[PDB]
Design a protein. Structure first.
Lengths: 249, 52, 132, 132
């Protein structure tokens, strides 16, 4: 009788996994988006005798840290990070989240902000001179020329701090901004060092790394799994009903 | 509406808006001083269900 | 009321209330707002064993229909009212598969209890003719 | 428990446990990991003829749910943890068509035993009115 619930579990969890892929898939063409891979966990129901039931909860181990793909936008202050690298950005609540979204913008007040909640590098939120004409170098140095001043006045004005942290030591944090797993903090501390070995390529954006083939195969498999569970549910229900005739007479 | 339908709806909406931006750019060739528009999207919030 | 009649009737009433809650959730999925303006909060019933004084068994009670504090899945429509800063409608968290299965299981439990009642009614009526 | 009732009820329980194992298998196909982190090994039940003393027949017992020791088909994903040297995930060995037919066959056996019970119960009740 309770087998029905196991089946329901799978079905319910299948939809959840679908949901993940949907959000995983709709975010194609979102700059720097790191696709969230999904998995299914068996959950045994260990009990008094004859351990037969296992449930099928859904889970998301992390994000696919395969670097997205580049788009040469020729915009002087769009940034592409190398593999396993992150830009540090102050979060809304106040903390150093990490992103691969390189669409840096300058406000009217000379404040460097990947979409608001601005960027952090070598100090606080990096602030440039008002008359920007900004350029960003290969290792992060940010130089500014006021547009109507001789081009031999391009003195640097900041350093865009970069971070190396990859895969299993970084987790998503209910924003687009990643953080450390709270286990890679009895490690490299709550704040990280610049790692002067991460390169920057200007004039290029990075798009999402959502593999469409894994999405399509995942969706096919999810639909089939759901409808197999539906057949099991039908069988269990109709068995129970066509069994309840025992108590009569 | 289960969550999957609405999320895919939003994805299709963003694709439509991107196509609108592209068509606006691309029809406005031979428009003096026209600056091309690049549409940039963003993920919505993540709703955690079971903490790791 | 008899004893076993009370037990089975309690089961029947509890299962009917469980089915009512399941139907309300199943029909109010995709319900933007309530009367005052508030997410439709999905409902569940609390089952407790009845017959509190004595024998620790007998009947089922459906005290205190409760409300599930599951994270209330959000959607983005910042033209709708009801949307906070970072416009987010609240859009109930009803699991449709869960409520369909709840409806089917409630119907089956209902049948088992009805058919218990028929059997017991037969046993009593045949007990009246004890001897004579 | 009356003897033939014991036989058919044991059959009901055994078929139900077989169906529950089959449902778990069918649901946990494509399950990367267990709780501690190990493959989900597909499960099977073992049927034995019950009533060890006497008549060498009568009833079915489903003691010792076992683990099907097939070689646990592998996939290559050397970015996932849980992947060994020569990165390979363990990926349950569940044959879905076999499990679907198992569910169908278990349901049919359940039908048969339920309806055997009904026949026998009617026979006993009509035996009670022997003479009077």
């Amino acid at each position: 009788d309770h087998a029905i619930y196991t089946a329901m579990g799978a079905a319910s969890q299948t939809l959840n996994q679908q949901a993940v892929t949907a959000s995983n898939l709709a975010n194609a063409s979102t700059p720097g988006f790191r696709a969230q891979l999904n998995a299914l966990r068996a959950v045994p129901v260990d009990g008094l005798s004859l351990a037969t039931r296992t449930l099928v909860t859904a889970s998301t181990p992390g994000a696919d840290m395969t670097p997205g793909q580049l788009d040469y936008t020729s915009r002087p202050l769009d940034v592409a990070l190398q593999q396993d690298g992150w830009l540090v950005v102050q979060a809304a609540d106040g903390a150093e989240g990490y992103t691969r979204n390189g669409n840096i913008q300058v406000g009217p007040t000379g404040q460097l902000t990947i979409q608001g909640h601005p960027v952090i590098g070598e100090g606080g939120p990096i602030t440039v001179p008002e008359g920007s004409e900004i350029t960003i170098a290969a290792d992060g140095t940010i130089s500014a020329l006021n547009p109507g001043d001789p081009p031999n006045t391009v003195a640097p004005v900041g350093r865009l701090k970069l971070v190396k942290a990859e895969g299993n030591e970084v987790q998503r944090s209910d924003d687009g901004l990643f953080r450390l797993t709270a286990e890679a903090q009895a490690e490299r501390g709550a704040v990280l060092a610049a790692d002067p070995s991460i390169r920057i390529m200007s004039g290029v954006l990075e798009g999402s790394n959502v593999k469409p083939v894994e999405a399509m195969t995942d969706m096919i498999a999810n639909a089939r799994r759901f409808e197999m569970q539906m057949k099991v549910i039908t069988s269990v229900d109709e068995n129970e009903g066509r069994a309840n005739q025992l108590l009569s007479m | 509406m289960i969550s999957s339908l609405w999320i895919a709806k939003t994805g299709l909406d963003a694709q439509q808006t991107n196509m609108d931006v592209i068509a606006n750019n691309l029809a406005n060739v031979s428009t003096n001083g026209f600056k091309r528009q690049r549409a940039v999207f963003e993920d919505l919030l993540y709703q955690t269900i079971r903490q790791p | 009321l008899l004893n076993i009649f009370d037990i089975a009737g309690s089961a029947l009433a509890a299962q009917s209330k469980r089915l009512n809650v399941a139907a309300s959730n199943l029909a109010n999925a995709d319900s933007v707002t309530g009367p005052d303006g508030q997410p439709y909060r999905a409902k569940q019933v609390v089952f407790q064993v009845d017959a509190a004084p004595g024998q620790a068994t007998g009947g089922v009670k459906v005290a205190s229909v409760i409300e599930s504090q599951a994270p209330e899945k959000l959607v983005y429509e910042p033209g709708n009212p009801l949307a906070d800063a970072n416009g987010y409608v609240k859009m109930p968290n009803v699991d449709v598969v869960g409520e369909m299965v709840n409806t089917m299981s409630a119907s089956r439990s209902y049948q088992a209890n009805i058919e218990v009642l028929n059997t017991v009614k037969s046993m009593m009526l045949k007990t009246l003719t004890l001897g004579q």
